[PDB]
Amino acid sequence: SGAIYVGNYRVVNRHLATHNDWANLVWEDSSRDLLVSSTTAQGCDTIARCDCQTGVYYCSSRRKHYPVSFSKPSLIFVEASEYYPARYQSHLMLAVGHSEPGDCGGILRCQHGVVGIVSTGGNGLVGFADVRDLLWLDEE
Numbered sequence: 720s721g722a723i724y725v726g727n728y729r730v731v732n733r734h735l736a737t738h739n740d741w742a743n744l745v746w747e748d749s750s751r752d753l754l755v756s757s758t759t760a761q762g763c764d765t766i767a768r769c770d771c772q773t774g775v776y777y778c779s780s781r782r783k784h785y786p787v788s789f790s791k792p793s794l795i796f797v798e799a800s801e802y803y804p805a806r807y808q809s810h811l812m813l814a815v816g817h818s819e820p821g822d823c824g825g826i827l828r829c830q831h832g833v834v835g836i837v838s839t840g841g842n843g844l845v846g847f848a849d850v851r852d853l854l855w856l857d858e859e
């Protein structure tokens with residue numbers, strides 16, 4: 720579990736979005752495993768605006784933050800998981816690291832702020848849904 724809180728937005732994995740999220744929907748994209756809902760309180764997170772490929776992510780199944788190198792966002796085949804069939808996911812970054820289904824929502828951060836959230840795992844990789852291209856998260 721986990722979310723990003725920026726302005727009056729909450730960014731969650733689409734597959735973990737609640738009824739309240741869907742009832743307050745701003746934007747969602749199944750291909751990216753992202754959903755954004757509206758919030759009452761202002762959030763603490765700053766979104767990175769950069770093409771970093773190094774950062775640190777939170778792994779809830781280890782209670783640990785790990786430094787990782789990660790691929791630039793691209794369109795990647797993902798094998799079946801507990802929460803999706805095998806399918807293509809867009810805007811996905813991969814690193815070598817541990818990720819189980821419950822790790823989804825852990826933040827990946829670089830020197831510029833939040834890069835994305837854990838979205839995929841298995842076969843010794845962790846996949847992150849990028850948010851750095853969502854410039855609208857920083858206004859209105």
Ligand SMILES: N[C@H]1CCN(S(=O)(=O)c2ccccc2)C1
Nearest residue numbers: 791792793794795808809810811
């Ligand atoms: N290698 C490229 C092509 C696929 N990716 S992407 O991150 O899925 C993506 C999709 C659409 C718009 C912008 C980015 C980047």
Ligand SMILES: N[C@H]1CCN(S(=O)(=O)c2ccccc2)C1
Nearest residue numbers: 734798799800801802803804805
């Ligand atoms: N192995 C894959 C096959 C599709 N799922 S699913 O989308 O997580 C799912 C789980 C339970 C009921 C309906 C859908 C995982």
Ligand SMILES: [Zn+2]
Nearest residue numbers: 769771829831
């Ligand atoms: Zn950066």
